[PDB]
Ligand binder design. Sequence first.
Ligand SMILES: *[C@@H]1O[C@H](CO)[C@@H](O)[C@H](O)[C@@H]1O
Ligand SMILES: *[C@H]1O[C@H](CO)[C@@H](O)[C@H](O)[C@@H]1O
Ligand SMILES: *[C@H]1O[C@H](CO)[C@@H](O)[C@H](O)[C@@H]1O
Ligand SMILES: *[C@@H]1O[C@@H](C)[C@@H](O)[C@@H](O)[C@@H]1O
Ligand SMILES: [Ca+2]
Lengths: 183, 193, 193, 487, 287
Amino acid sequence: SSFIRIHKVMKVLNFTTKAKDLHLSDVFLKALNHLPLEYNSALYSRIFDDFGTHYFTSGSLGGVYDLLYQFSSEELKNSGLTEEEAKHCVRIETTKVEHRCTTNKLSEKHEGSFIQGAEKSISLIRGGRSEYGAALAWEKGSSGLEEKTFSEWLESVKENPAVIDFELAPIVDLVRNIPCAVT
Amino acid sequence: AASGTQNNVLRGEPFIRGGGAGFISGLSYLELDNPAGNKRRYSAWAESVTNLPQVIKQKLTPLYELVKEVPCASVKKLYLKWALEEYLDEFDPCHCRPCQNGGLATVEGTHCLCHCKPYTFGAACEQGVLVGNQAGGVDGGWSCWSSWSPCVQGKKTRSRECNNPPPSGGGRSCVGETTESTQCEDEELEHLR
Amino acid sequence: CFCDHYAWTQWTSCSKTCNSGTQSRHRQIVVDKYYQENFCEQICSKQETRECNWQRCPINCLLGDFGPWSDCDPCIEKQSKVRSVLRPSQFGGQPCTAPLVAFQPCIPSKLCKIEEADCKNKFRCDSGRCIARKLECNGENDCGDNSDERDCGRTKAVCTRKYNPIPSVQLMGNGFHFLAGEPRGEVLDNSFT
Amino acid sequence: VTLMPIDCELSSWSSWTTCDPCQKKRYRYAYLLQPSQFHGEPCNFSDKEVEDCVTNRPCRSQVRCEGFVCAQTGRCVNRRLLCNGDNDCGDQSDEANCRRIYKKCQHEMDQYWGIGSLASGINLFTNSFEGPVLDHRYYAGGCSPHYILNTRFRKPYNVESYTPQTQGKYEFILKEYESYSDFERNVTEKMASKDRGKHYIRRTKRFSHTKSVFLHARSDLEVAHYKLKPRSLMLHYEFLQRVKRLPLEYSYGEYRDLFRDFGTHYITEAVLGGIYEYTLVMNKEAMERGDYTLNNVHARGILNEIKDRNKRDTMVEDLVVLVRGGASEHITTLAYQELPTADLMQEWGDAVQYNPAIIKVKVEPLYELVTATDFAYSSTVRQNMKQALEEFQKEVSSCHCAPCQGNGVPVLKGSRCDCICPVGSQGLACEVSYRKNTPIDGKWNCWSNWSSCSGRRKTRQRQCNNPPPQNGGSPCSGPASETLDCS
Amino acid sequence: SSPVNCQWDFYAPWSECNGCTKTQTRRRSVAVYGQYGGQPCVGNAFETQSCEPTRGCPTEEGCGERFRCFSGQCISKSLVCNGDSDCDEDSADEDRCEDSERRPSCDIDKPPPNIELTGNGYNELTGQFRNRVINTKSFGGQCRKVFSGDGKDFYRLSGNVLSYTFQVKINNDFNYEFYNSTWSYVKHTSTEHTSSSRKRRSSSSSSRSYTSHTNEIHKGKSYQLLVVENTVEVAQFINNNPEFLQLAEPFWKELSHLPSLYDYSAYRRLIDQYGTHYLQSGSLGGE
Ligand SMILES: *[C@@H]1O[C@H](CO)[C@@H](O)[C@H](O)[C@@H]1O
Ligand SMILES: *[C@H]1O[C@H](CO)[C@@H](O)[C@H](O)[C@@H]1O
Ligand SMILES: *[C@H]1O[C@H](CO)[C@@H](O)[C@H](O)[C@@H]1O
Ligand SMILES: *[C@@H]1O[C@@H](C)[C@@H](O)[C@@H](O)[C@@H]1O
Ligand SMILES: [Ca+2]
């Protein structure tokens, strides 16, 4: 049995958002203008279902690779040979004479084999571009990293990252310069 | 006297969604020497899916929530809501006496079809053999909801019997609450009129 | 030993319907000159055992009954009704299925106190966004509406070459939903120059 | 050949209708009592007759047009569609005398690949396409761009969506069986005494070997999904005009000849792509007998010796391949007897995108197009067309054909029936084959007419081809008797 | 199990009378659903007849200060001659405008590669996608560009959509399991005799062989493979809430023609075309 797990986290990019005077998304600014001036729990809750609760003040834009590979193999082997023999002779006389003999014999042979195997792999990729990410995710993983496939995927990640880690401020700090903003 | 036999059965069912039609027909074509599929063809498919994707995971909002900007919109919204509940009650698989061998069922309008799991077949899924990991037994199927109780103390109630089939031979029980209760319809009648 | 000389018995039904049971199968061993001589006692396995029903027991959703209809919003002409999750669903239990918030039309009972932008020296885009006056006739669409460029003379000097934006830059401007652990909607405009 | 060629018989004529208020005509027709088959006479002698009349009744046939009436086609285009730089009348009449042209389409645009095929009606009872019923060359305002890959397309007005849903099943089975048996039984016997003697031998074999292969490969490729608008469809000129020729009074003939030209239903939603199917069946046998003997006797003496040896072998193999959608070289190279290389499969699926077949359909019956915005007396045309559709389904269903031999499928092509043969038989009845038996599938006779009321009954007998003959296959899959309420 | 032939129930009481069509409809439930290959219910789950309505047919309401598109939908007068087809279906907002009054609304005219599939309906019970419910391409007079990077191309988003993103995720799962078994057996048996005698002269002798032998060979092989592989290429589309969504023209037209009373035969024909739900969010990719 053999097992191999790989996890790699790569950070091709790393950004910080301003502290003040940010320019807001059109669809967000529309929903903030639409909200009632008096409190309603349902209508204001719907902002969190649509836009979430916090925004990234800094983070790492990255690619992630995860692989598990797991192999089991079993063999059984059998061989056997056998022989058995018995022989029985007699003479009687008194003119009259008789002489006799008899035999019984056996052999057996056996062979047997049983081979059994299981292989599993599980892999996740985040970030990159689907042709190279496919090429890397498709690796059964029996030897761990194939550095050619991995380095083509990492060159994809530089062109199309995914989020890996982050720092947060609440969405409510952004709601600035709309009508009735403070309210 | 001497005798021998062989049987060999080889099956495979590649299924693909998304990607370009040529890449799909190339990748789904089964190499018996490499039945998982080839690195090159599969990577080409993964390129093409960037340009011909399909929705593969989704979160759902009920269709009545879109009734807007028409005459009678407020009333049409509630009647589409009740028609969804009536459609769900017409097509909910509880109307089907369930299939053997782990098969789900669907309502084909007036009719029940079994979706037999791999290499098991026939109308009840009685024929053939299963493949892969199994828990064994017969898992518990619901019978349909009993008809809704008439707004006693301002709320309806209904009950479901878990007896179609009853969980048997060690199979897992029916999933969901055995009973439900809800507010009445006076809000539609009074407020919208 | 050819341990396959004794049967592929059916696995006995899983001990638990959920939260990691186990199931086992035992060989139909008859001890004989074959079993004795071929080392069967030493190196066969007499019964196999494995995990089954590893999935945690399914937890169904329970919703509360709805609250009162809320104080009606004079600028929206609707009133809102809410209910609370008693326990969320998880581990494959039935989803809450019905809506968790509801709306009804209303005859309001107050005026609207909302105010116009009137935004000093700044430039009011057609969408009402008061962008910086430096961006009027700048030659890039800074209102999103193009309204900063509706009619202009010789526009100010845009950055000379075409340049692409940073890879995935709009992910830096999506909002994140901390309780669900995921991005939800574009909150910052990371196409703005 | 066991055949008798059977001639077509149409009925005696209907009585005439009384003269139509708006067509100024009268009509009579015949029912096909027996289709022509097995090279009987070609028949089709005019199934309908029509005459003129003097008219003593009023007519209101002019459904007005707030639009513009197109000069040649009579179509009512909405007045905003004039001078858009496009042919909305069908025969260009909307773009005459325009002081300027106001193009909406800023760019060049394709029609979606094959979108015009779906504009024609289907004879659902034979799955045959028929004449054009909808105008997918009409766009109204149009000119909102859609992209499949990098190509830009202009959506027809009648089409609600054409979109590249893109899916592929492949299914493979290779089932193989081998079975062999060998038997041998030798004997030897001797005697001598000092005179007399004997010697004798027998030696023998019986043997058999048998093999079977069943192989089946299917690719169901989908490349687009299509749905038609549910309402306000712009109909095709040739259909719009034959519907305006229909009598107000019910003559079956003039409604039947609409269905024989434009089909019975229209495609409201469809799944587009290609089928590749390949299926091989092989059976192989080898058989032997050997028998050898000597007898020798002495006292004067005699000898006899015999040898008998026999070998037999057979193989029988059938292959069927079926391809739908694509381009002619990919079609033929897949049509070829040897399973594809993946390169051809790739090129076939790539070509299926540009010429799809229809995999699955949602129909509506064609009278649902006959809306009062296009036709006067529309409700009486609808009710006639509904009744004709029931009577016609009872004519064009292939249950009328005499039974094929050799498990042939009879198809009623026109007033004439063709037995489409399976692989391994030939001749017009599928009679000419080397085979000792082949499974007959059961064939239904036509379903007997509605009897009485308070719940009517219809009956079927599986008699047209009885299921069991020559080691028969499956008895027919449908309801052997059926019932429906007056009210 | 036996085939079960389908059976209808008795007809239900009628629904209130439809003003616009001057009719009443009544329902008929399936009493026994057909099962195990038994015959389906022939005829219809409904019937409809003429009636004199108390309740009248409702009217449209007008677009007022908004621009009326030919469908009956209303759009803002800022979108007339925007240079985009801002009315769904057949634009009318673009009609007979001057070449100096038309302007480029945006640099580019190309949406993300299957954004139309994100505005489809969904049927929860059949699991199938259903026809167009949301207009996914209402550009709202805005040039909302995204650079992608999974394909190296700019695309234009609708003004409605909350977010659309091209971060990839690829998840692969492989399971392969095989066994091969072989047995071989041989047996041989032999039995023999001889005897000789003399008595006085007279004498006799005899001998024998008997033998039996047997072989068996047996094999079983099994292999199973499962692969489940998923790709996401637009790892999120997040559609807006119903207030800011723009409906598809033929969906809004069918909604307009809903009878304003509980005739389930009308609402079932919407649900059969457009499904039970709409997609609030999801991932585009492949499987
Ligand atoms: C229709 O049919 C009869 C048949 O005798 C004709 O003679 C006559 O013209 C009638 O109108
Ligand atoms: C109870 O629940 C569903 C909807 O929640 C119904 O559609 C089903 O038929 C059952 O009665
Ligand atoms: C029942 O349907 C109509 C009713 O007259 C006819 O085609 C015929 O009676 C059929 O059996
Ligand atoms: C199996 O299923 C649940 C629902 C209960 O019946 C327990 O027996 C166990 O978790
Ligand atoms: Ca024109």
